[PDB]
């Protein structure tokens, strides 16, 4: 039905501004009273400021206040989420809901990556299975990526084969400014003079799809 | 215009729960809540302090006042194990609690650890990890300590955690240690003991570079 449309993933530069779009493809707008949280890597829901049409004004919540500015113009029945002075803790997931209290209907979210690092394929590196990489008759493989930038970059082995104890693990941000992760798959001690592995990162901020291949 | 929520529980199937989420300042009934698990986006759950928002299974009851309010289920299933979040829709900025996140309660599983020594790509690239696993295990509250040459380390080491698995409910961690090519080939020993609410005795991990 009501649907929420909102603007293309960011990476500006610690200190650029952003304004974000949110448009709304349902019924009516006037009323809908949109309203704008964000979420920064696995934290609460925050936020930042709604507003209302018919009523043209908004406000804006505390620490955000003055670096801030939603809009919405009606005439288009789209809302705007203008964040300046970026910061390194202003990067995260931007949604803008509606609500026409309640909050119904939210937007697909928005990432902004705000760091002074730039765009970068990852490495990658195959975490060898050898002695201290077994017990019983499980050992375990993996492929460690590294130093990439922006989120995210997936990860599938023998090409989507290989489905069973496959552990993807969540990205991790570095003080250098690139995120890094790794995915092991504990398989069979046998099967390893047996069959083929290889993991298929892909990092597609960066047109990238890297193919390694992991061995004792 | 704060809201209070404990972070986490734990809890099994078809058990009774009530998160509690309470108010600095009266609110009356402008108490909201909502639902939502990784990925994923805000699905309303609750509002009016206690409506049910459409589409939503009758174990989910809101109820309370003032102040202080309260998230009820019923009975609990697969699906209900999300992270719950309380918002104050009162005043002119609506406030949102901490969160809390309900994980699926089972029997302690030991962790399986794995001490993968650096590449060579990555030695010969200029730096090197060293990469500790540790798989299915629960809870998922592992310590990871590094060590090197004997000495005890911090701040070099970065963690981190897979979201727990529908299948068999357990967790795995991957403590990654990066050092400088030089930094790194100036040291022997190279382990990472593991205490765990699973293990009586911490179990140690490691390889002595250069071999």
């Known amino acids: 039905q009501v649907q929420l449309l909102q603007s293309g993933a960011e990476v500006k530069k610690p200190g650029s501004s952003v304004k974000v779009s949110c448009k709304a493809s349902?019924?009516?707008?006037?009323?809908?009273?949109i309203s704008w949280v964000r979420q920064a890597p696995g934290q609460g829901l925050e936020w930042m400021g709604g507003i209302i049409p018919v009523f043209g004004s908004a406000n804006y919540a505390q620490k955000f206040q003055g670096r801030v500015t939603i809009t919405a113009d009606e005439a288009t029945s789209t809302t705007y989420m203008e964040l300046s002075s970026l910061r390194s803790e202003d990067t995260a997931v931007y949604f803008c809901?509606?609500?026409?209290?309640?909050?119904?209907?939210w937007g697909q979210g928005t990432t902004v990556t705000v760091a002074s690092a730039s765009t970068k394929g990852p490495s990658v590196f195959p975490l060898a299975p050898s002695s201290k990489s077994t017990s019983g008759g499980t050992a375990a493989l993996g492929c460690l990526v590294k130093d990439y930038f922006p989120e995210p970059v997936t990860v599938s082995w023998n090409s989507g084969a290989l489905t069973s104890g496959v552990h993807t693990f969540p990205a991790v941000l570095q003080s250098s400014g690139l995120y890094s992760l790794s995915s092991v798959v504990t398989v069979p001690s046998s099967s390893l003079g047996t069959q083929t592995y290889i993991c298929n990162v892909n990092h597609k901020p960066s047109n990238t799809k890297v193919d390694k291949k992991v061995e004792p | 215009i704060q809201m209070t929520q404990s972070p986490s529980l734990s809890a099994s199937v078809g058990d009774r729960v009530t998160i509690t989420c309470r108010a600095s300042?009266?609110?009356?009934?402008?108490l909201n809540w909502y639902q939502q698990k990784p990925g994923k986006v805000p699905k309303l759950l609750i509002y009016a302090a206690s409506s049910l928002q459409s589409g939503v299974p009758s174990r989910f009851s809101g109820s309370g006042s003032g102040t202080d309010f309260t998230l009820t289920i019923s009975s609990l299933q697969p699906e209900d194990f999300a992270t719950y979040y309380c918002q104050q829709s009162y005043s002119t900025s609506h406030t949102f609690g901490q969160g809390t996140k309900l994980e699926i309660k089972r029997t302690v599983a030991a962790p399986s650890v794995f001490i993968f020594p650096p590449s060579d790509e990555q030695l010969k690239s200029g730096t090197a990890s060293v990469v500790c696993l540790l798989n299915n295990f629960y809870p998922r509250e592992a310590k990871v300590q590094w060590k090197v040459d004997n000495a005890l380390q911090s701040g070099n080491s970065q963690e981190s955690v897979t979201e727990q698995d529908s299948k068999d409910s357990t967790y795995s961690l991957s403590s990654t240690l990066t050092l400088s090519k030089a930094d790194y080939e100036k040291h022997k020993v190279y382990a990472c003991e593991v205490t765990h609410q699973g293990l009586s005795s911490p179990v140690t991990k490691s390889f002595n570079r250069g071999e």
């Open positions: 300042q009266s609110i009356s009934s402008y």
């Open positions: 349902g019924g009516t707008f006037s009323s809908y009273a």
């Open positions: 809901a509606k609500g026409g209290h309640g909050m119904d209907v």
